[PDB]
Every structure is written in C-alpha cells, then in structure tokens.
Design an enzyme around this catalytic site. Sequence first.
Site, PDB file in Angstrom:
ATOM      1  N   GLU A 146       2.279 110.697  32.349  1.00 44.08           N
ATOM      2  CA  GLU A 146       2.836 109.392  32.704  1.00 44.08           C
ATOM      3  C   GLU A 146       1.748 108.509  33.300  1.00 44.08           C
ATOM      4  O   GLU A 146       1.863 107.285  33.324  1.00 44.08           O
ATOM      5  CB  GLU A 146       3.904 109.482  33.801  1.00 44.08           C
ATOM      6  CG  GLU A 146       5.307 109.767  33.294  1.00 44.08           C
ATOM      7  CD  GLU A 146       5.750 109.083  32.013  1.00 44.08           C
ATOM      8  OE1 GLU A 146       6.229 107.938  32.089  1.00 44.08           O
ATOM      9  OE2 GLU A 146       5.621 109.710  30.942  1.00 44.08           O
ATOM     10  N   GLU A 154      10.333 107.134  39.498  1.00 44.62           N
ATOM     11  CA  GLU A 154      11.325 106.622  38.568  1.00 44.62           C
ATOM     12  C   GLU A 154      11.033 107.094  37.144  1.00 44.62           C
ATOM     13  O   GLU A 154      11.975 107.440  36.433  1.00 44.62           O
ATOM     14  CB  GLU A 154      11.401 105.105  38.685  1.00 44.62           C
ATOM     15  CG  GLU A 154      12.478 104.465  37.826  1.00 44.62           C
ATOM     16  CD  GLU A 154      12.296 102.976  37.548  1.00 44.62           C
ATOM     17  OE1 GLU A 154      11.616 102.283  38.358  1.00 44.62           O
ATOM     18  OE2 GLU A 154      12.813 102.508  36.508  1.00 44.62           O
ATOM     19  N   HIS A 155       9.744 107.202  36.773  1.00 47.25           N
ATOM     20  CA  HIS A 155       9.347 107.651  35.438  1.00 47.25           C
ATOM     21  C   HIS A 155       9.620 109.146  35.286  1.00 47.25           C
ATOM     22  O   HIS A 155      10.201 109.592  34.293  1.00 47.25           O
ATOM     23  CB  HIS A 155       7.858 107.394  35.162  1.00 47.25           C
ATOM     24  CG  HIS A 155       7.505 105.983  34.854  1.00 47.25           C
ATOM     25  ND1 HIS A 155       7.057 105.596  33.611  1.00 47.25           N
ATOM     26  CD2 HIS A 155       7.513 104.871  35.620  1.00 47.25           C
ATOM     27  CE1 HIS A 155       6.803 104.305  33.621  1.00 47.25           C
ATOM     28  NE2 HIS A 155       7.071 103.833  34.845  1.00 47.25           N
ATOM     29  N   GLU A 193       0.913  99.967  31.699  1.00 47.47           N
ATOM     30  CA  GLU A 193       1.882  98.992  32.176  1.00 47.47           C
ATOM     31  C   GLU A 193       1.175  97.920  33.000  1.00 47.47           C
ATOM     32  O   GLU A 193       1.624  96.782  33.027  1.00 47.47           O
ATOM     33  CB  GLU A 193       2.928  99.651  33.072  1.00 47.47           C
ATOM     34  CG  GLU A 193       4.155 100.164  32.345  1.00 47.47           C
ATOM     35  CD  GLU A 193       5.172 100.802  33.278  1.00 47.47           C
ATOM     36  OE1 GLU A 193       4.783 101.705  34.061  1.00 47.47           O
ATOM     37  OE2 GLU A 193       6.342 100.369  33.240  1.00 47.47           O
ATOM     38  N   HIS A 203       7.659 103.966  42.143  1.00 47.38           N
ATOM     39  CA  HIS A 203       7.774 103.569  40.752  1.00 47.38           C
ATOM     40  C   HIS A 203       7.390 104.730  39.844  1.00 47.38           C
ATOM     41  O   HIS A 203       7.940 104.886  38.754  1.00 47.38           O
ATOM     42  CB  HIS A 203       6.897 102.355  40.494  1.00 47.38           C
ATOM     43  CG  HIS A 203       6.994 101.886  39.090  1.00 47.38           C
ATOM     44  ND1 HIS A 203       6.049 102.211  38.147  1.00 47.38           N
ATOM     45  CD2 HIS A 203       7.926 101.130  38.467  1.00 47.38           C
ATOM     46  CE1 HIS A 203       6.371 101.642  37.005  1.00 47.38           C
ATOM     47  NE2 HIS A 203       7.527 100.987  37.167  1.00 47.38           N
TER      48      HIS A 203
END
Lengths: 54, 75, 438, 383, 124, 61
Positions: C122, C52-53, C129, C49
């Site tokens: 990030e 993906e960022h 998140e 994940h």
Amino acid sequence: ATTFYNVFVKRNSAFVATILASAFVFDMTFETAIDNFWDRINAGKQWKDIRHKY
Amino acid sequence: YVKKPSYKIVPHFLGFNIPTVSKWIPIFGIWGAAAGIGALFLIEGVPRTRQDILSKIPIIGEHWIREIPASDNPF
Amino acid sequence: VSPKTRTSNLKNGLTIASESNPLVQTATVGVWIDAGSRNENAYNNGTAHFFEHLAFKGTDKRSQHQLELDIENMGGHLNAYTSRESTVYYAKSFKDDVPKSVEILADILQHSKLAESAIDREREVITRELEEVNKQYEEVVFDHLHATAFMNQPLGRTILGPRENIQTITNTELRKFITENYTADRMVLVGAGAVDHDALVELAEKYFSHLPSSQSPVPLGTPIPNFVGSEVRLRDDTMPVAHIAIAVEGVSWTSEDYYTALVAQAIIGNYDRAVGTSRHQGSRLSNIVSENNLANSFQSFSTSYSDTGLWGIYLTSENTTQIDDLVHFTLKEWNRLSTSVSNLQVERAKSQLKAGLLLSLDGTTYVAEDIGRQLTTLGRRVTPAEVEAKLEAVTEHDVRAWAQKTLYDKDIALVGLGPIEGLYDYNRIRNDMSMMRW
Amino acid sequence: MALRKKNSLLNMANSYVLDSPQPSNLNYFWNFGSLLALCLVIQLATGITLAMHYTSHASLAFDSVEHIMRDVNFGWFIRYAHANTASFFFICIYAHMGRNIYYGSYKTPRVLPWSIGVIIFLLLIITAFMGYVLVFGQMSLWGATVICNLVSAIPWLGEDIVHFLWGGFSVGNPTLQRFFALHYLMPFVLAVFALLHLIALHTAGSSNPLGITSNVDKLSMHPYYSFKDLITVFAFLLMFTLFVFFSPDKLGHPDNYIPANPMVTPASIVPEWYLLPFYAILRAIPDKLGGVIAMVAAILILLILPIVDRSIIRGNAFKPISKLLFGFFICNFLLLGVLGQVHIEPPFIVLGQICTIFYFSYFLILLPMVSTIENIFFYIGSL
Amino acid sequence: ASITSVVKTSELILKSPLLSKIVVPLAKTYVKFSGYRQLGFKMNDLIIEETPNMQLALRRLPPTESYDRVYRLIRATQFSLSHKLATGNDITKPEEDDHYLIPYILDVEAEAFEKDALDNLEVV
Amino acid sequence: GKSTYKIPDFTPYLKKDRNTDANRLFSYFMIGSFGMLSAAGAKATVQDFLSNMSASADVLA
Ligand code: HEM
Ligand code: HEM
Ligand SMILES: CCCCCCCCCCCCO[C@@H]1O[C@H](CO)[C@@H](O[C@H]2O[C@H](CO)[C@@H](O)[C@H](O)[C@H]2O)[C@H](O)[C@H]1O
Ligand SMILES: CCCCCCCCCCCCO[C@@H]1O[C@H](CO)[C@@H](O[C@H]2O[C@H](CO)[C@@H](O)[C@H](O)[C@H]2O)[C@H](O)[C@H]1O
C-alpha cells in the site's frame, strides 16, 4: 483593549474623530509647553524679562 | 398548509430603504462630530472663533483669553 | 415530523444510535469515531489514512479475497473516510443483511491483520496518491488553506501525511494508533433506514463488546488553535481557471455563535453560472458576480472543528483581469455583515436555513452521517425543534455583533491557485476587510 | 502599426485631434468648443505679454496700462486684443452652453463633462472679474468693492473673510497685488478643467444634433472638422478685427479711463456686460444673503438639468414645445442682462423680479412638466 | 423617465373618454409638427439608448428589425448633415410608425423593477 | 524543498499574541499618532502660511 478598540478604533468615523480631537489637544498643550520651555532656556534675555524696568 | 410565501415590499428609493439607512444614522453622527471638530480646529486661530466659541468653554476657555500688554503693542 | 433517534450505551461505553424509516428497504449501519489525523504527531502523520487502506486488506479470519467475496455476497457496499477529527466506516445493505454488515465492520476494526507484506504494497499506492490529488483543485486549495491558517499546528497537517512518513509507517505504529484512538467511548454505532434499534443493540453486544475503554473517558466531541493570517500563492499560468479561498477563524461545533455564523454564511450564499436559477438569487454578491461575469462559481463555507473553525468563501473564475474586482466585491459584501445588515437579510437567510438543514437529510446515508456527526461532535442528536428554536433566536443584532468581532478588520488566510497574477498582495486584500466610510 | 498609434504620447494627441471618431452631422454650433480653445490661447498669449509690462502696485498699475497703450510697441493691440477677447470668450461660452442645453448634451451619458463644464464657467467668471480689477480705474475699484462686499453676507465670519480677501480694510494695494497673482494663475486652472471635461466626454463621444447614436456613422476629426473649424476661426477673426482695430472701446466703460478714486463714487457701478444677468438676479431678492444665494444658485442650478429633464429623447430638434420654452428662457436671460444695467427705478424693479422667477421656474417647474407631457404626446401621437 | 412610466400614464389617458377626446388630437398634431417623420425616422428610433436597459432591449431586437433601424439612423444622419428632408418613400408614413422597440424595453424594465422590489422584501 | 504543504519557517517573525485586540490596538495607536501629528502639522502649516494674506504690519500701522 477590546473595549478601547470597539469604541475608538473599529469605526473609522470614530477613529478619525479621535485623531482630530487628539490633534486639537496636542496643538494647544504643545504650544503651552514649548512657550514655557523657550522662556526658561532664554531667561533674562527676552523683552518680557526686561520690560519691568521701563 | 401554506399557499403563498408571506412578505411585503418595504419603501425604497435609489436603492436605499429605512432599515438600512437607520443602521447608518449613528455613523453620520460621528462623521458630523469629526467634521465639526476638524472645522473648528482649522479656524482655531481666527480671533472671532476664540472670542465667540473657544473662550466660552468652561475651565478650558481661559487658554484663549490672552492680552498683549499695552506697552508692547505698537497698534 | 421525523421519527425519534433512539440511543443506547453498552457497558464499555459504546454508543448505539438509530433512526428507523419503514418506507425504505435499505439500511446504512456504521461506526463513527471521534478520532482522525489530528490525533497523530509529526512523526506518524498519515497513519490514520494508512490504516483506512489496510482495514480492507484482510483480517485474522477472512483474507483480502474472502473479505471481497463476503461483501459481494451481501449485495451492498462498504465505505470509509478519514478526516482531521473524524473517521467513519459504514456499510449500506439490504434490510436483512444488516447482521452480516455489522459483523464485517466489527472484524475489520478489531481484528485486522496489518501484515508487513500489505503495508509494503500500500506504501506505493499511497505514494501515487500524493501525485494525483494535484488534480482535485478544490482539495488542493483547502489543504493549503488549513496548512497556512493553522501553521505548524495539528489541524494544519494533511491527512495523507508527508512522503517521508509513508515510507516509514510500520505495523507497530498502525496498531498503536488504533489501540489508543479506536476506543469504545470514542465510537458510535449508527443505523439509519430499515434497522430495528433493539436488534442493532444486540448486534453491538455480540461484536463490539470486547472493545477497549480509554483510561480517562472524556465526553464525545471533546477537543489551542492559534490562527495565522497568511497567504499561499500557487500561481500556474497554464491553468485557465483561478481557484481562490479566503477564510477567517470561524466557530467550533459548540460555539454559542454556531447558528449566527451559519446565518451569516447564508446571507452571502453560493453561486454557480451553470445552474439556471443562480442569476436570480437574492444574495447581493450573487447579483454583482452574475451581472459582471466575475466568476464561474463561489461557495460560502463555515467549517467547524472541536475547538476552532474556518469561515470563508471559495471562488472560481476564468476572468483573469478582474480577479481584483471579484475579491473586492466579495470582501465588501462581508463588510456589510458588520455595517448594514438588517432584519431584511437576516430573516430571509433564516427562512432558507430552516428548510436547508432538513432538506440535506434525504437518504439513509445522509441520515446516518447526520446522526454520527452530531453524536461525535455534540454528544447528542439535536432534534429539529431545538434547531428551529436556535435559528429563530438569531437576530440582526447577533449577526452584526458576530461579524464585527470575527470578520471586521481581521486577518485572513488566503490561498490562490492558477492564473492569479491579478490577485493583489496580502495588504490590499486585507485592507478590504474594513470600510473607511464606516 | 502607424507611429501615431504606437507611440503613447503621439497616440494621445491622435485620439483627440486626428483619429477621434466624430458624428458625421455636427452643425456649426459644434464649433464653439474650438473657438473657446482659441480664446483661451489668445488670452494666454496676450495676458503673458501684458504681464511683462504691467506693474501690480496700486501706485503704478493704471499708469503701467497707459504705458502699454502709449510706449510699448504694439502695446495698444495686445491690450485691446486682451480686453475684447475677454468679451468674445463669454459670447462663445454662452453659445457653447446654449448649444449644450438645446441639444441635451447634459443628459446621460454626458453628465460628468457637463458638471465639470459648470465649474469651468465659474472659473471663467472669477478670472475675468479679477482681470478687470487690474486696470485700477474707477470701475475696477468700485466693482471690486461692491462685489467683494457680497462676501460680508456669509453669516458670522463674513466681515472677517472680506478683510482677509482684501488684505486690509478696503480695496487697495494688497488686493490689487493678490488679484494680479490669482488672475495669472486662474487661466491655467481653467485650461486643466477644460482638458478634464474633454477627457470625460471621450467615453461617450460628442452628441449630435439629432440626439441619436453616432456609433453607426463616424467621421475622423481630421480632416473634416479641422477644415470646418477654420471657417469659424476666420469668421471669429473678422469680428475680432472689427472690434480691436476699428472700435476697440465699444464694449468698455469710459469710467475705467479715470484712475481709481476711493472718495468719488461713479454714477453707476455695474459689472461687465457678461455678468449682468447674475447681477439682475441678485437685485431681485431684497435680502443681502438671499440675493447672494440666488445669484450663486442661478449658476449651480445648471447641475440639476440631468434630473429635471424627464424626456425619453435627447435634445430639442424634434420637440416643438421644448423649443418654444427654450426660446423664452434664452430671451429672458438676455432681458435679465439688460435689467442688470438699468437704474434701480420703477418699473424695472418688479420686472427684474418677474424675470428672476421665470429664470428659476424653467429648471424647477416648466422643464419637468413640458418634458413629461411631450413624452406622452410622442407615445400617443405615434400609436 | 422610464418607458414604463410613459406607457402607463398614456394608458390612463386612453382609457378616460374625455381625456382621450382632448389629448389624442393634440398628440397627433404634436407628432406632425415634431417633424421626425420627415427624416425617415420612426418614433422609437429617437429614444435615448445609452443606458444598460436600452442596450439590453436593443440586443433583443430581431435581426431584421435591428438591420432596418441601423439603416434609418444612417439615412437620417445623411439627411441631417446635408440639410435635406426625406422625400417620397423615405418619409415615414403614419402607418409605418410602429412601436417596434416598446415591447422589448417594457420587458427589460419589468424585470429590472421587479428585481428592485424583491431586493427590498421583508419576510412577514 | 518539495512539499508545498510544509509551510516555510516563519517562527523568527510570528507574534504569539497575533489575534488579540491588544495586538491590533498597538499598531493602530502608531497609525493614529501619525495621523494625529499629520493633522496638527497640517493645521499649523495652513494657519501660518495663509496668514500671509491677512493685513500686513505696515497696513495695520
Ligand atoms: C481666460 C483667460 C483670461 C481672461 C478671461 C482675462 C480677462 C481679463 C480682463 C477682462 C482684463 C481687463 C482688461 C482691460 O479692460 O484692460 C484683463 C486684464 C489683464 N490680464 Fe487677463 N484674462 C485672462 C488671461 C490672462 C493671463 C493668462 C494673464 C497672464 C498674466 C493675464 C494678464 C492680464 C493683465 C496683466 C491684465 C491687466 C492689463 C490690462 O488691463 O490689459 N490675463 N484680463
Ligand atoms: C474654456 C471653456 C471651454 C472649452 C475650451 C470647451 C471646449 C469644448 C470642446 C472642444 C468640446 C468638444 C467640441 C464641441 O462640442 O464644441 C466641448 C464639448 C462640451 N463642452 Fe465644452 N468647453 C468649455 C467650456 C464648457 C462649459 C462652460 C460647459 C458647460 C457648462 C461645457 C460643456 C461641454 C459639453 C457638455 C460638451 C459636450 C457637448 C457635445 O458634444 O454634445 N464646456 N467643449
Ligand atoms: C484636445 C487637445 C489635444 C491634446 C490631447 C489631450 C491630451 C491628454 C489626452 C490623454 C488622456 C487619455 O485619453 C485617452 O487616451 C487613449 C489613447 O490616447 C484613448 O484610447 C482610444 O484610442 C486608442 C487608439 O487611438 C485605442 O487603444 C482605444 O481603444 C481608444 O479608446 C482614450 O479614448 C482617451 O480617453
Ligand atoms: C480651510 C482652513 C480654514 C481657514 C484657515 C485660517 C486662516 C488664518 C487663521 C489664523 C491665522 C492667524 O491666526 C493667528 O495665527 C498666528 C500664527 O500663525 C498666531 O500668532 C501666534 O504665533 C505667532 C508666530 O507663530 C506670533 O507672532 C504671535 O505673537 C502668536 O500669538 C495667532 O495666535 C493666531 O490668532
């Protein structure tokens, strides 16, 4: 185990029928077993043991 | 081209239909057996049950043929 | 009858699959990868994940800003998502902007910078998140559902990963992950809409030819999960709506019972008080629920993975004193898949599904998602004729036999969130998985 | 909040006897329920008192009843009160059941209180039958003999069951002692079922003579129906007084003042008057088992009234044809009663059979047909 | 019995000339002897209402019709408890005995019965 | 401690063969045995107890 489960346990109607049939067998066999055991531990004492003299 | 969906209404009564009931017919059977075994078990002690039903069963039936010796019976 | 899905391979083992539609003017091209969170261990959980960022944070050529501009200039958009077993990166564009989009996707997958400065930036975004998924109740419920059903197993892990890992993920482990997993034999380049297959194969030969092959190439959609009957309760009296999921272990993509489980799911179906037609649906559970106001909605699901699945229902309700009735009636409808279903329900569900499986594919993105999913789970796109035959093969005997081995008297995984005081304990819920009258 | 509402125990009483919302238009036939409760209280009080002086052993039973009459202070009153209130209990229960049938009290949503009511009626019959045996006079013994021998009709096990009930090979001491214990018990069971049918009723409330909803216009049970119940309580007590003090033996059989003698058979063996209609129905069927089935069916068929009444309207107040049919049904039930105590002679044998057919055809043919036709007449007649 | 049943059978009779010639006069006399008009009721006020279908039909009555029904029931209850009959304008005249509720219950039952049928459909 | 997705440790209690028919069957054997002895015990109890109502020894004499 799958087979046994599927036949005797899965349907409650079958489970209850198996339990009741087992209880019938238990009742008859337990009766006979205890009768014999009782007669052995109390051997020569009971009427059935002295009856033959009379 | 299809103008209308193709279906029928099956006969029904009190919210039961034959397809559904037919699935339960075997279950009524097993419940009937369960009720039969249970009833018979409950009256196994009744002397007539033994005389008429239980003593007639092959092999097993001798379990219920038991005589009091005449020497041991006041009645 | 839809156009044929064309399929080609490259030398490295990259699959190219396309379905052209000369009636549209847009095209969705992208890369479906047979890899996702499940491929992480406990220490690098969250990596997929995280990547993906970073995929959109700049490559060896285009910087973050240049990347933004290049896509803006294309006219369409790029999108990505990481799941437990699958990662997708796609680009929707105009017909003649397809070579640009393939080039950008090839760049962000093969040649991403993963610069320490961007990792660090990030690392805060992803940390935020963690505290905002909390609002998406359906996702909270499904993530707890996986966590408990597959307790301490890879499928049980979340996609975001723990807070601890987010703080310790390095560019090294990011690079290691994508080198081990993003291999050509695990990847499918998919095009749907206004694409030429032969053009797409050429673009694949131009951009994806220097992809690593894995040492031991297994077939696409190749995987042992041990389901745990269990419950998570997240009671929150301040929430007005209860969210409840109940599931049993379901079927994998390649199970022989895959269609049987879909038919069974369709017999229960979905319901939503907000939709006008829902009060008139044929499903028995729908009728019970709507007549008695037991729920705002329910949604039956049959989620598949490579080697397991979850089959169950997701319920939402404001009726906090009758949650017991809602759960009771739901599980008694499941009991009937074992005891009572006949050709009446089975043929009705088959009718509904024969259309449903085709209706779902109503745009290029849906078509691409269908080609990509099927290629990465089954190794091939299954034609609608084959699907119609597999559905037609489902009988009422198949449904009853499946439900008797999968649902009847089986352990459930149960998650409750919100005002769930009225949800009874595990035993009373699990006791509704059988019927004493049968 | 008022204590009577706040406290859970007081609130239960409150809900049934005080704040209970009633229709404002119940007529005097809604008073039989409280009369039945009064009979039940009198039977408990007098019955427990008799038990303090009665001896259940067959050698002493009849004489213990004579000792009650002769030596116990006010024993004569307690005994006559108990014996006559048994008859009043049946007059009130037939009235209460007749009210229920005329006004459609068995229809939805009152099927459950009605069905429990049918069991109450069976328990009352058994209670009264066992109590009558306790005197151990001639009618006591011979009534026990003939009624208990009906069980012999049960196929296969019938004879065994009879000997089991008697505790021997004929009605004797074991039978009398077990009937005493069960006669003491059965009234408590009856009180529980009476409470159950009221709790079941409480969901819909009382019906009313018009057959419409009373949710539009309710009256508290107290003081309105409390004071209206007092009128019928005092009317009942006047009837009670006339029998108990001035004619205490009018409703009895002289043969029950002769001690039980298994050798001598009385001229005519009949049940107490309130069981006579069921006895006539039994005689009508020539087969033993047939007759027993018919007799039990005559009571259990009450359970099908909710189904065979096809009317869209509850009760008979506005149904002239139904009212005529109900009148014939009731008078037929009284004639069956009379035929239960005549001799088995011409022409009463055939008349008993015709009346029995009429009894059953009310439930199975006439009520379904008449209620169907009246539905159509209401609709067409008001167009 | 369902209102649907009653209405359909009645319509079969009203169609047949012979049948109507003999049934309609009987039905009118029946209604006269029934005597519900002498308590100020309309026929439909007497229909059993403690049913899901009837509760739904009553909820669909227009407010005016619903308020007037409540008054007729209260008024009839007062006549019943007083052992009096209506007099004058309280007596329902034959022209006032309108089937205000029949269309509502027929619609409720139509849906209920269609639902039952469709719950038993078999794909052919 | 904080994350609710980290299931607490149930390894001290979890059976490895929890989804097997053998696993369920064993527990139903215990339930069944208990139901069986309850049925046989009830039958014995009812039969012996109700026999009090059959003719006593002095009556049979
Ligand atoms: C519904 C309640 C009751 C009914 C219908 C009822 C009925 C009867 C009847 C019909 C008799 C025959 C009376 C006679 O002719 O002498 C009787 C006798 C008797 N009852 Fe009850 N009874 C009831 C409650 C009770 C209760 C609760 C007891 C408590 C023990 C009891 C004790 C007796 C006794 C001891 C006798 C015999 C003495 C005698 O005949 O008076 N009864 N009963
Ligand atoms: C010990 C015997 C009984 C007692 C003490 C008793 C008591 C009562 C009482 C107090 C009520 C409410 C008031 C009333 O309507 O009178 C009532 C209502 C009722 N009872 Fe009984 N009852 C008994 C036996 C029966 C029997 C044998 C039946 C039926 C076969 C029955 C059926 C009903 C029904 C249907 C109602 C509701 C009637 C209505 O209000 O519309 N009861 N009972
Ligand atoms: C008639 C004999 C007198 C004794 C009363 C009988 C004793 C046993 C009755 C208790 C059985 C439970 O009975 C039940 O009680 C509750 C409260 O008491 C009632 O409840 C009713 O009254 C209360 C306030 O009065 C309200 O909160 C409620 O909305 C209303 O339904 C039920 O309508 C009744 O069915
Ligand atoms: C709804 C339930 C169904 C009806 C219930 C049945 C009621 C009575 C039936 C059987 C009662 C008498 O049945 C009889 O029971 C006694 C035990 O109690 C048994 O007697 C056995 O055990 C007793 C002591 O336990 C010994 O004294 C005796 O010598 C021995 O034979 C008889 O073998 C059986 O014939």
